[PDB]
Design a protein around this ligand. Structure first.
Ligand SMILES: [Mg+2]
Ligand SMILES: [Mg+2]
Ligand SMILES: [Mg+2]
Ligand SMILES: [Mg+2]
Ligand SMILES: [Mg+2]
Ligand SMILES: [Mg+2]
Ligand SMILES: [Mg+2]
Ligand SMILES: [Mg+2]
Ligand SMILES: [Mg+2]
Ligand SMILES: [Mg+2]
Ligand SMILES: [Mg+2]
Ligand SMILES: [Mg+2]
Ligand SMILES: [Mg+2]
Ligand SMILES: [Mg+2]
Ligand SMILES: [Mg+2]
Ligand SMILES: [Mg+2]
Ligand SMILES: [Mg+2]
Ligand SMILES: [Mg+2]
Ligand SMILES: [Mg+2]
Ligand SMILES: [Mg+2]
Ligand SMILES: [Mg+2]
Ligand SMILES: [Mg+2]
Ligand SMILES: [Mg+2]
Ligand SMILES: [Mg+2]
Ligand SMILES: [Mg+2]
Ligand SMILES: [Mg+2]
Ligand SMILES: [Mg+2]
Ligand SMILES: [Mg+2]
Ligand SMILES: [Mg+2]
Ligand SMILES: [Mg+2]
Ligand SMILES: [Mg+2]
Ligand SMILES: [Mg+2]
Ligand SMILES: [Mg+2]
Ligand SMILES: [Mg+2]
Ligand SMILES: [Mg+2]
Ligand SMILES: [Mg+2]
Ligand SMILES: [Mg+2]
Ligand SMILES: [Mg+2]
Ligand SMILES: [Mg+2]
Ligand SMILES: [Mg+2]
Ligand SMILES: [Mg+2]
Ligand SMILES: [Mg+2]
Ligand SMILES: [Mg+2]
Ligand SMILES: [Mg+2]
Ligand SMILES: [Mg+2]
Lengths: 86, 208, 48, 116, 55, 136
RNA sequence: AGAGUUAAAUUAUAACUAAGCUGUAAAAAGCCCUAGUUAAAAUAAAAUAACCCACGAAAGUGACUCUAAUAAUCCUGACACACGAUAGCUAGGACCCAAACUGGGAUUAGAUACCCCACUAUGCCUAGCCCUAAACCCAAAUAGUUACAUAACAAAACUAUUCGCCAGAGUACUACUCGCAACUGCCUAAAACUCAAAGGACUUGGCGGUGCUUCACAUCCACCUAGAGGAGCCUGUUCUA
């Protein structure tokens, strides 16, 4: 409120398409986890209930990165096989 | 369903077969049709290649049938097409030349124009949410609405005529009043549209 | 995962951002316009 | 980059105190999570309320506006075509990834070893 | 040579799998100690159980 | 390098819609709450030229939350603003709710022009304690 | 532990504008000294950084700056000595927000609740208490080793020196005692009686108003047709006879 207005979280339409613009916007606010925090600060969460969420989210991201990792490392052998019906 | 899935439907139209030589993808299509050894259904007895059959007339006829009588319905439809025709003659010969250019004496195009005009655009479906049934605006496919119009016509004229009043007369009346939009059929259509508007917000209840 | 700095340098960057903000060197709610066109270090692609 | 698994969990060697409390053991499971089927929206709503406007102004004479109606039925036809096409679309997957089956044979080719 | 999917009870249960009575390989030879899921191949364990030497 | 979105308060840039600088273009304040949406188009000098709500639109307690009613307040707002002679609008959306996208398309649909979209959403850096979550 | 500081938000309270605003699955109640926008201190709380893993003995500690400052040439150790989250008590301030309680509104057979609206003690500061937590990482401290080894699961298995603790289940975070700024408290802690079990893990089912996928083809919803339940009568039960 004490900062200069319209410099914060602003995107201006180009070539008159509003929809696509709002899309870029939401993509941003989501990139920074602002949407999350808004839906999250709609209500409270006690600190316990918060650390649970934290750990869960972290374990989940670890498993994710690992999974994606074994997937993409194995991506090479998904081609049509050489030795079939030996 | 004495047929397996193997049996394809009969194409009853004479004009498609009589004139094959100017169409490539269609020559290819009915060639792939009869070359495959396709078992083809016995054509229905109700449908004929006659130049005088309208499947619209066919389905309104059928929908009017009760019990096992195709005869009684074919007759009531004959008498309705007749009442509309001759009544349009009675309106034509009592009129002035301008209106002798205007008036429609064809009961067929008057029928198609009586159903095209009586057809409600959107229609409601109940949805259960939080324990309540809300009626929600639904975009409808052509055939369902066709059915809607026909059914409304039959239902109304079965229902609201007095006991001395014959069926084909009453149906001629409502056909003609539906041509000009002023009969109770389009009133039911309009109540359908009013109830379609009052609740339009709930259309966000629609998931499909 | 974006900046890609060691622990030390990230923490110093952060302490620095806060210290530049409350003393009044740098604005909190946005990047200063002047610096929007600077060189781009980070791996964020906003526009696709 | 993968979040460090060092020193996080609670074990008998650990000098520190627990960071992560795993619900289930962290092991790459042989299978992969199946495709999550997406939900539906309310389609065609725009032409719907456009035509609602059209009727509340015209005293509910359909004859007054031919255009709103036709665009509404063209939209309904676009939605039906969209539903049939989204039904036969099962070849979709993630488009640049593989459908879950092929992933699963792929992984049952190279499992992760808890044992031995 | 058996180079193929190894039916589980081959050596363990010969008489039902192979025939009413049968004589068994006196010597097994492995060109790999693995099967395509990178476990010890069954026939290691099986031969070992069946009193057969292995090279 | 064309249409970089954030036009600066410094005068380095000349871009004019209806001849006016970005700074002279009347704002549209759209509040989208879980229960409502209300649009107010105001001068650059902050004198209100239009106000339209979902509840001032003819809806009621439930359905007024819906997106239909958001584009609906959008149109009548854009018309009452149009009547006082505003061509363009730079938009600011307060709140994340059912009526955001609906009212933002709903303005352009009621014959008004959109140029800028910014988000002013209250974002506590840890100010006030929000009310308890609901199952309890 | 001090001393100072405030970024986003909120609100007093003014000025324009609009008559509605708030709220749920859905509604009422409630407020219209209301809402939007523009202005603005006080109190409170500390987005992002953090996918980090530091500090403290534990409880704890993540807005900013500075001052003070993290015991021990380092094995163990009590009922002694100093600490100890929340809530609670006493006195003096604070009060944007949240909120037990209570009062309305719905939900319901009832609803002392879940859902909404207010609003208080109470969270906040200073001094003094109270000394309890699933105070749990249910894994004692200090040296070690990966040798022997799988009850079961889970955080793989062990030596050595210790200190604390455990003799069926209830009865029992109980009755009596002692001590304590407590006097519905804390600590320490039985027995008569009753039972033949109480318990840890596990297995197969069955079930789940759990999540996910795919279906129902006269079949659940949507949709089609003709009926039943009303009438007379036929016939079968059930009561009375
Ligand atoms: Mg302000
Ligand atoms: Mg401030
Ligand atoms: Mg985060
Ligand atoms: Mg430590
Ligand atoms: Mg667990
Ligand atoms: Mg925080
Ligand atoms: Mg509870
Ligand atoms: Mg102090
Ligand atoms: Mg205010
Ligand atoms: Mg709601
Ligand atoms: Mg009221
Ligand atoms: Mg965080
Ligand atoms: Mg930590
Ligand atoms: Mg010092
Ligand atoms: Mg030390
Ligand atoms: Mg020590
Ligand atoms: Mg010691
Ligand atoms: Mg205490
Ligand atoms: Mg207290
Ligand atoms: Mg007090
Ligand atoms: Mg108070
Ligand atoms: Mg005050
Ligand atoms: Mg309050
Ligand atoms: Mg009550
Ligand atoms: Mg009940
Ligand atoms: Mg419930
Ligand atoms: Mg209050
Ligand atoms: Mg405190
Ligand atoms: Mg703890
Ligand atoms: Mg625990
Ligand atoms: Mg702990
Ligand atoms: Mg304990
Ligand atoms: Mg125990
Ligand atoms: Mg000890
Ligand atoms: Mg050893
Ligand atoms: Mg076992
Ligand atoms: Mg005992
Ligand atoms: Mg206790
Ligand atoms: Mg006691
Ligand atoms: Mg004592
Ligand atoms: Mg049925
Ligand atoms: Mg059935
Ligand atoms: Mg009956
Ligand atoms: Mg009966
Ligand atoms: Mg008897």
């Amino acid at each position: 409120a004490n900062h200069l207005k319209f410099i914060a979280r602003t995107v201006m339409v180009q070539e008159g398409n509003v929809e696509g613009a709002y899309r870029t916007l939401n993509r941003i606010l989501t990139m920074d986890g602002l949407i999350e925090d808004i839906k999250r600060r709609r209500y409270y969460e006690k600190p316990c209930r918060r650390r649970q969420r934290e750990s869960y989210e972290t374990c989940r991201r670890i498993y994710n990165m690992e999974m994606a990792r074994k997937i993409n490392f194995l991506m090479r052998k998904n081609r049509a096989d050489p030795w079939q019906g030996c | 369903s004495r047929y397996g899935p193997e049996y394809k439907d009969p194409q009853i139209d004479k004009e498609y077969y009589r004139k094959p030589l100017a169409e490539q993808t269609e020559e290819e299509k009915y060639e792939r049709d009869f070359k495959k050894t396709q078992l083809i259904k016995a054509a229905p007895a109700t449908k004929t290649s006659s130049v005088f059959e309208d499947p619209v007339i066919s389905k309104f006829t059928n929908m009017m049938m009760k019990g096992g009588n195709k005869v009684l319905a074919r007759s009531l439809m004959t008498q309705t097409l007749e009442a509309v025709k001759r009544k349009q003659f009675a309106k034509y010969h009592a009129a002035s030349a301008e209106e002798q250019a205007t008036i429609e004496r064809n009961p067929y195009t008057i029928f198609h124009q009586a159903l095209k005009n009586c057809e409600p655009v959107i229609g409601l479906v109940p949805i259960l949410k939080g324990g309540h049934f809300y009626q929600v605006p639904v975009p409808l496919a052509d055939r369902r609405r066709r059915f809607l119009a026909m059914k409304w016509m039959i239902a109304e004229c079965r229902e609201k005529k007095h006991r001395r009043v014959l069926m084909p007369e009453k149906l001629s009346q409502e056909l003609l009043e539906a041509f000009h939009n002023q009969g109770p059929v389009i009133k039911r259509k309009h109540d359908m549209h009013k109830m379609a508007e009052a609740n339009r917000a709930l259309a966000h209840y629609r998931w499909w | 995962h974006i900046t890609g700095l060691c622990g030390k340098k990230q923490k110093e960057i952060t302490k620095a951002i806060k210290r530049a903000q409350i003393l009044g060197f740098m604005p909190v709610t946005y990047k200063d316009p002047a610096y929007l066109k600077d060189p781009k270090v980070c791996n964020i692609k906003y526009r696709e | 980059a993968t979040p460090s698994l060092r020193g996080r969990l609670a074990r008998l060697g650990n000098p520190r105190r627990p960071i992560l409390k795993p619900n289930k053991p962290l092991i790459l499971a042989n299978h992969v999570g199946e495709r999550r089927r997406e939900k539906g929206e309310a389609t065609c709503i725009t032409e719907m309320s456009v035509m609602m406007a059209c009727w509340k102004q015209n005293e509910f004479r359909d004859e007054a506006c031919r255009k709103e109606i036709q665009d509404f039925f063209d939209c309904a036809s676009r939605a039906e075509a969209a539903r049939k096409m989204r039904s036969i679309q099962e070849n979709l997957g993630e488009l640049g990834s593989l459908p879950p089956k092929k992933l699963n044979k792929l992984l049952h080719r190279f499992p992760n070893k808890p044992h031995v | 040579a058996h180079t193929r999917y190894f039916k589980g009870g081959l050596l363990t249960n010969a008489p039902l799998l192979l025939g009413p009575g049968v004589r068994l390989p006196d010597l097994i030879i492995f060109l790999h100690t693995l099967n395509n899921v990178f476990e010890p191949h069954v026939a290691v364990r099986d031969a070992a159980k069946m009193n057969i030497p292995t090279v | 390098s064309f249409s970089i979105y954030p036009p600066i308060p410094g005068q380095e840039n000349s871009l004019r819609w209806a001849g006016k600088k970005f700074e002279e273009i009347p704002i549209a304040h759209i509040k989208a709450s879980y229960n409502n949406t209300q649009i107010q188009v105001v001068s650059a000098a902050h004198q209100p030229l239009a106000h339209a709500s979902c509840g001032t639109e003819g809806f009621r307690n439930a359905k007024k939350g819906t997106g239909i009613a958001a584009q609906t307040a959008g149109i009548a707002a854009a018309a009452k603003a149009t009547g006082k002679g505003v061509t363009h609008v730079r938009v600011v959306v307060k709140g994340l709710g059912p009526g955001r996208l609906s009212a933002i398309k709903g303005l352009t649909m009621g014959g008004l022009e959109v140029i800028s979209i910014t988000d002013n959403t209250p974002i506590p850096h840890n100010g006030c304690r929000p009310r308890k979550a609901r199952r309890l």
